[PDB]
Amino acid sequence: PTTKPPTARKYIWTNHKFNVSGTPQQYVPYSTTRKKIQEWVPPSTPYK
Amino acid sequence: SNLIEVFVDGQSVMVEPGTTVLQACEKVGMQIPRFCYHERLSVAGNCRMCLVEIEKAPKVVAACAMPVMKGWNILTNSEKSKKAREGVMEFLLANHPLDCPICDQGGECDLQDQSMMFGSDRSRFLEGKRAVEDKNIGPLVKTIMTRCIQCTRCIRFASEIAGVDDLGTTGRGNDMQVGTYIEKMFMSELSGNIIDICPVGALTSKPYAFTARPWETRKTESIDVMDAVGSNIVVSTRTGEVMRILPRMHEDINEEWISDKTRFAYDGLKRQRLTQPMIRNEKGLLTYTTWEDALSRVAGMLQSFQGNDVAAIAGGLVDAEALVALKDLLNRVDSDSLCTEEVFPTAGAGTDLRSNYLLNTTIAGVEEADVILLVGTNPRFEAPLFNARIRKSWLHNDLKVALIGSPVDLTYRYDHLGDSPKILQDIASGNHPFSQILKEAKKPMVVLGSSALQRSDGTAILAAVSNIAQNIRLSSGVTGDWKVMNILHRIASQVAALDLGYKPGVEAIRKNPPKVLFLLGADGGCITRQDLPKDCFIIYQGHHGDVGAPMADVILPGAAYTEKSATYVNTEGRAQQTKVAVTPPGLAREDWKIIRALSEIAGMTLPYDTLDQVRSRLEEVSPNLVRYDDVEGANYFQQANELSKLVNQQLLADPLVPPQLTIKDFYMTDSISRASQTMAKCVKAVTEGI
Amino acid sequence: QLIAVDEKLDITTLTGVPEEHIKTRKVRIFVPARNNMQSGVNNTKKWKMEFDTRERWENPLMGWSSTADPLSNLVLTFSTKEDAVAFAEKNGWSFDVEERKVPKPKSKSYGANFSWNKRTRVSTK
Amino acid sequence: LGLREIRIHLCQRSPGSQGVRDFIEKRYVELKKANPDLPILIRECSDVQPKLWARYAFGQEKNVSLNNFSADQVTRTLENVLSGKA
Amino acid sequence: TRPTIRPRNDVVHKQLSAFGQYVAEILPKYVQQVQVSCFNELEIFIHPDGVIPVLTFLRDHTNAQFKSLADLTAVDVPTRQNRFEIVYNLLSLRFNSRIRVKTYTDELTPIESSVTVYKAANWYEREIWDMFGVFFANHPDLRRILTDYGFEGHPFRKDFPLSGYVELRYDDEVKRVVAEPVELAQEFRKFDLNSPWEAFPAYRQPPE
Amino acid sequence: GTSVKPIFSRDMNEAKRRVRELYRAWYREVPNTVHLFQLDISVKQGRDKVREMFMKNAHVTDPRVVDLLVIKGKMELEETINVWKQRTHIMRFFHETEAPRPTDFLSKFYVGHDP
Amino acid sequence: GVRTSPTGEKVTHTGQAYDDGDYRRVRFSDRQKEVNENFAIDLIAEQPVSEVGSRVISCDGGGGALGHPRVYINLDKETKTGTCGYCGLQFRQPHH
Numbered sequence A: 001p002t003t004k005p006p007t008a009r010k011y012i013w014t015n016h017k018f019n020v021s022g023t024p025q026q027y028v029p030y031s032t033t034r035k036k037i038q039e040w041v042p043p044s045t046p047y048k
Numbered sequence B: 001s002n003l004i005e006v007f008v009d010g011q012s013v014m015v016e017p018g019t020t021v022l023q024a025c026e027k028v029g030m031q032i033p034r035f036c037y038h039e040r041l042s043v044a045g046n047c048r049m050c051l052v053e054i055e056k057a058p059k060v061v062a063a064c065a066m067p068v069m070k071g072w073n074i075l076t077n078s079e080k081s082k083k084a085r086e087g088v089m090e091f092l093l094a095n096h097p098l099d100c101p102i103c104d105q106g107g108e109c110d111l112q113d114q115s116m117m118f119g120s121d122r123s124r125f126l127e128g129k130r131a132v133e134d135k136n137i138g139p140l141v142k143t144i145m146t147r148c149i150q151c152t153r154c155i156r157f158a159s160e161i162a163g164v165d166d167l168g169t170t171g172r173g174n175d176m177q178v179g180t181y182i183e184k185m186f187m188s189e190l191s192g193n194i195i196d197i198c199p200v201g202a203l204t205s206k207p208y209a210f211t212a213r214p215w216e217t218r219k220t221e222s223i224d225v226m227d228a229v230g231s232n233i234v235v236s237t238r239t240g241e242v243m244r245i246l247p248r249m250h251e252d253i254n255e256e257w258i259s260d261k262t263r264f265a266y267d268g269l270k271r272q273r274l275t276q277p278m279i280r281n282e283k284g285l286l287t288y289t290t291w292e293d294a295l296s297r298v299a300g301m302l303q304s305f306q307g308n309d310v311a312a313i314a315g316g317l318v319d320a321e322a323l324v325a326l327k328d329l330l331n332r333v334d335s336d337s338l339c340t341e342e343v344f345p346t347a348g349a350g351t352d353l354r355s356n357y358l359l360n361t362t363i364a365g366v367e368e369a370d371v372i373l374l375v376g377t378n379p380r381f382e383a384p385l386f387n388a389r390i391r392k393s394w395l396h397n398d399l400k401v402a403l404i405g406s407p408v409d410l411t412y413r414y415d416h417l418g419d420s421p422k423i424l425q426d427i428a429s430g431n432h433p434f435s436q437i438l439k440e441a442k443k444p445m446v447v448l449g450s451s452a453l454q455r456s457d458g459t460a461i462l463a464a465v466s467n468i469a470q471n472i473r474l475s476s477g478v479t480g481d482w483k484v485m486n487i488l489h490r491i492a493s494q495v496a497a498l499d500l501g502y503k504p505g506v507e508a509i510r511k512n513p514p515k516v517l518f519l520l521g522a523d524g525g526c527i528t529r530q531d532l533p534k535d536c537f538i539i540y541q542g543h544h545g546d547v548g549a550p551m552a553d554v555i556l557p558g559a560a561y562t563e564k565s566a567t568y569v570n571t572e573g574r575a576q577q578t579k580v581a582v583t584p585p586g587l588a589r590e591d592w593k594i595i596r597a598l599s600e601i602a603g604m605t606l607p608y609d610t611l612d613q614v615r616s617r618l619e620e621v622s623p624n625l626v627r628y629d630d631v632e633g634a635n636y637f638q639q640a641n642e643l644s645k646l647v648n649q650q651l652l653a654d655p656l657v658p659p660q661l662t663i664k665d666f667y668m669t670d671s672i673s674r675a676s677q678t679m680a681k682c683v684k685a686v687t688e689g690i
Numbered sequence C: 001q002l003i004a005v006d007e008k009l010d011i012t013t014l015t016g017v018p019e020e021h022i023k024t025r026k027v028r029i030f031v032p033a034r035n036n037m038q039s040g041v042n043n044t045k046k047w048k049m050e051f052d053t054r055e056r057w058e059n060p061l062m063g064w065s066s067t068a069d070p071l072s073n074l075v076l077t078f079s080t081k082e083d084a085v086a087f088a089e090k091n092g093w094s095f096d097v098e099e100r101k102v103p104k105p106k107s108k109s110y111g112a113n114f115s116w117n118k119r120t121r122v123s124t125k
Numbered sequence D: 001l002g003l004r005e006i007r008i009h010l011c012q013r014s015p016g017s018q019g020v021r022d023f024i025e026k027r028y029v030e031l032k033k034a035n036p037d038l039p040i041l042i043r044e045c046s047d048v049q050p051k052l053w054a055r056y057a058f059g060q061e062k063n064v065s066l067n068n069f070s071a072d073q074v075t076r077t078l079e080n081v082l083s084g085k086a
Numbered sequence E: 001t002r003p004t005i006r007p008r009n010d011v012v013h014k015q016l017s018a019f020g021q022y023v024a025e026i027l028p029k030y031v032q033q034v035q036v037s038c039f040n041e042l043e044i045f046i047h048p049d050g051v052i053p054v055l056t057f058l059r060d061h062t063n064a065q066f067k068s069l070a071d072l073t074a075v076d077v078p079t080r081q082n083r084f085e086i087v088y089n090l091l092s093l094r095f096n097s098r099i100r101v102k103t104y105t106d107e108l109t110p111i112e113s114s115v116t117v118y119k120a121a122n123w124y125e126r127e128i129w130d131m132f133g134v135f136f137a138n139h140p141d142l143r144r145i146l147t148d149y150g151f152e153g154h155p156f157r158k159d160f161p162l163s164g165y166v167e168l169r170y171d172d173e174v175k176r177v178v179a180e181p182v183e184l185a186q187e188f189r190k191f192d193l194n195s196p197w198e199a200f201p202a203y204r205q206p207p208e
Numbered sequence F: 001g002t003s004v005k006p007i008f009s010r011d012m013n014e015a016k017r018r019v020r021e022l023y024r025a026w027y028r029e030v031p032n033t034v035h036l037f038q039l040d041i042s043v044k045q046g047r048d049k050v051r052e053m054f055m056k057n058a059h060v061t062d063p064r065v066v067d068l069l070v071i072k073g074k075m076e077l078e079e080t081i082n083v084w085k086q087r088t089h090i091m092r093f094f095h096e097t098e099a100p101r102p103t104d105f106l107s108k109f110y111v112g113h114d115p
Numbered sequence G: 001g002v003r004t005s006p007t008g009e010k011v012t013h014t015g016q017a018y019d020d021g022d023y024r025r026v027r028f029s030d031r032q033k034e035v036n037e038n039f040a041i042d043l044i045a046e047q048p049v050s051e052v053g054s055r056v057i058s059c060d061g062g063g064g065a066l067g068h069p070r071v072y073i074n075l076d077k078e079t080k081t082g083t084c085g086y087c088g089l090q091f092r093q094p095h096h
């Protein structure tokens, strides 16, 4: 990469990170989609 | 008989005169490739994909338009036919955009599939492609017209089926564009069908856009409950979630079309849902609880009261299993106050004779009938597919249509007799020209709308309509087995409830107010707490929080129509069953199971444990409920008319005004469509154009 | 020499299927409806047997769709309705049979597009 | 003892329901006028056999076969059911 | 039809057709059908009773000499009254040829074991019994070969589910591996792939 | 006529005799299985379980199906005697880690949707 | 275009964040929530609209065969720009 430097992009990490498994920086999976079914909200006032 | 003999690849076929080459080919199980031809639309012959060689004929013919001649040998797989198909496919693909990854049609695209089956595998087009601008025609049908292949299917559908002449072609040559030429919305109760007939991704569903691919969807064949037409549908699901609704072909009900409410209101199934049992707090607010506690409270109240003190109201989306379970449970308490929201006249035969509250001609019978009189109805919005069938027979059989009521747009020309109810009597006495028109008809049809029935005099209107039908029956002789008297329903649950013995309307509850009131999906606002004694115990069972849920003491979450296998009877009297597409959300349960569990906790256990046993009980109450495609029935018009002649309730001087006057009133008529954001967008679009 | 039995065929005890997935299941025997998005009819030729749809839920990790019934993806293909009925009967499955739906033959006339006195006349091409 | 509903299940064209059909054609109207507030639900059966159901107070109900009955026998059966018999 | 298309061999096609006619003439008691495919493969469809007499003939006749049993497997076709198709693939080294012998059976009808004809058949028959439930009469030692001990069902049947009915895990309360009804965190996603347009007109069936 | 080929037995009597032979073999084998596999159950528990497994198929009336069931039972016994099965396979008959599934309508209603 | 929730949890570009009462947040204790900081929608929002002097423009995403399938975009409408359905790049004919 000294004679043939990589192409620059603004989204490329400027700081390389190593394998962070076993550390508080480790990756934790989670669902990335929104809630599908919306529940009815009962009225907040007494009905009688 | 009059058949002629043709040959398909040397195989003999007998066809009737007027059969086209394409139809003769499909008589032997050979499907000719097509783009512009549709068997429910007029022949166009413009796509040229159906070109096929006739033996000893130098020039290929368009199989979709060419009548087949006697002795012709159609060569479906000859070199000439295959080369013609390849050339036409090349021409179709020359300007088509490379959109398949981003096009919603991909995977269920007739252009893609017929390119793979009948086209070549590469390109030799070395020019630039044409690109056209997009047309905004509403919030339902997304338009990307660079993909348009100029089939003219949408134009022919809009003109012939929907009766709207707003689509067309502008320009000519390579520059010909399909559209409206002005910024205009194609808002029809049948508009969404142009998505399905469009072979390509030019017209797509806007609510469905980008969400799923065809190969990952599971198909559940079911029935629509948005009206009383009972259109056969397919629910597409993926990974436990409803994706979209598609028509399912049934020649005698809906053909291959559905209304826009059937097609697009499914998103309301994802909002305002009841997922847990609820009970009132010490303060008076609704709070979640377990099934055990809520059912125990309901059972204690049920054991407290008896007879008239207990009543139930059935909503418009209730199935027959839950209806019969609730009727059995309230009969165990010795209560007969089983009511629906939709009023039907109980005078005379009432619900004793089934043909008294049915569309006895049936939807298919409209094709046969020479004349039809509509009273107090706006069939276009109350029963869109029935109106489509009426327009079909108006177009093809020159049917004469007359309307008594408000002069609504029905997408076909009709003779408007007025809106005064007295016209009926004026017709029945013979003092009207239309009386003579009806007398000389060979297959007359009288349709009375159930919406007209909502009015208090409803009984007088029914008596007058029956008297008109009796005059037709006696004066014009007997034609055999042709039914004249018809009732058109708008409520999916009404006919099953009438078959099971429910009392139409809530008049019984107003006569004797109950201490305990069961609301089974009832969201019409017919009975409020101002109509009931104070400290009345109200139980709401359903799937959505509408008008009914807030005023109840206890909420029992039930299953929607896509979440259960359940029986619905349409306007014709035909029983059909849905299937489970997705299970009920949260703690919600099947409705008849809720009632059976309640009966067990209350000590009066019902004799059925499974769905088969509940359907056996249905057979014990009304056997026609287990015959799942039967539409046949006995004609008991004479007895019903004779009994209706008993009392002489007076008509009112109020013009027949249907609840649905324009398109904006059509989109929201039930708890599911009121919760639908797509229907809200449609209402907003038709109210203000912009 | 043959032994001349006289009882209906029943292989439930030999298939290794759990009891619950024999007596509580309902199979549907039907010819699948044409997908309305396409005009091809090649997927409407054979009979299909499928099972009743059971519960699917959300996996707490990843939000994937989880199931517990082993028959959720079982679809069998048959040449006729009678073959499917026989197969369902010998396996002890309760079944619901839906009759085949064929489109009715239709009268197509191109010339009717230009009728002298009928309503079938088209206003555009 | 408290009669609540009557149900008559007859088959449309089976011979065994002929008498029931005769009844519905001839004597149903007078029966309905005599008992205007009593539900008499006329429904159609598949070919098993004609039936008459009577539903009483608190959900108890009885059934009686009408197979091969004449109009007279159906009339007698309905007369006994509507009165203090059996 | 040049570079892209696979070439034909009329000589082998004719030779195989003639030998199939030969076999059918010699054994009319059992041979029900003979076929030669367009890629030059000979199939003989026989009644089950002839499994042993036919195979023996094909092994021992001077003009057949099919000494090698390459493979023996079963195919499940639930629409047929006789569910299971039994397939024998044989190789003759003397004549450098291959042949296929086909027969049928249902769930309750035994098929004669062919270990006395080909010893190689032994394990193959075991596998069939393991995967399809076809019982072979007079097999020297017939038992499961591929499945777990105590496994219930025959996995290769079309109506057997892909993931089966039970799965395994280690349980610490009992300190052992246990079997429990199968539960999947992600359900296998069924795909509907068939195009609704016919692909091969040469295989179109009559529309009944 | 029905023209059906037998497996071992011509009628139900010979099939029942083969069932009795297999039952005797299993009953004799159970104590050896308890000793060899070092099970924590009693011999009575194992024999009760053997009886239960046999009783599971009491309703069968087809002699061919009975013959095939006896064949499968003989295979299982041969697996057990030769210690091809391990302790996990033997204990799989008892389902000691599966929670008791309710049978009455109300408990199934509370817990979920399955009929 | 990252953004934080009332709980302090970063909101992803999919708009997914655990509610205040959601137990599943426990999975991030003593650990972190992986979030990509380069929001594509904002990045494509910063690209300028290209002025071209033709009614139809061609886009393949740059790089020739290293881009996306080449599509043609109509620019007749003066009320809006022409957007590429693959790349998001915008085009228009000179106006004003």
Ligand code: SF4
Pocket: B096, B097, B098, B099, B100, B103, B104, B105, B106, B107, B109, B110, B111, B112, B147, B199, B200, B201, B202
């Ligand atoms: S319409 Fe069909 S061929 Fe055209 S881009 Fe869409 S999927 Fe591809």
Ligand code: SF4
Pocket: B147, B148, B149, B150, B151, B152, B153, B154, B155, B178, B197, B198, B199, B200, B202, B203
């Ligand atoms: S939008 Fe579809 S139906 Fe209309 S002309 Fe174009 S391809 Fe044909």
Ligand code: FES
Pocket: B033, B034, B035, B036, B037, B044, B045, B046, B047, B048, B049, B050, B051, B062, B063, B064, B065
């Ligand atoms: S299908 Fe006949 S020309 Fe289009």
Ligand SMILES: [Mg+2]
Pocket: B105, B194, B195, B196, B197, B198, B199, B200, B201, B202, B203, B204
């Ligand atoms: Mg389309």
Ligand SMILES: [Zn+2]
Pocket: G059, G060, G061, G068, G084, G085, G086, G087, G088, G089
């Ligand atoms: Zn681009």
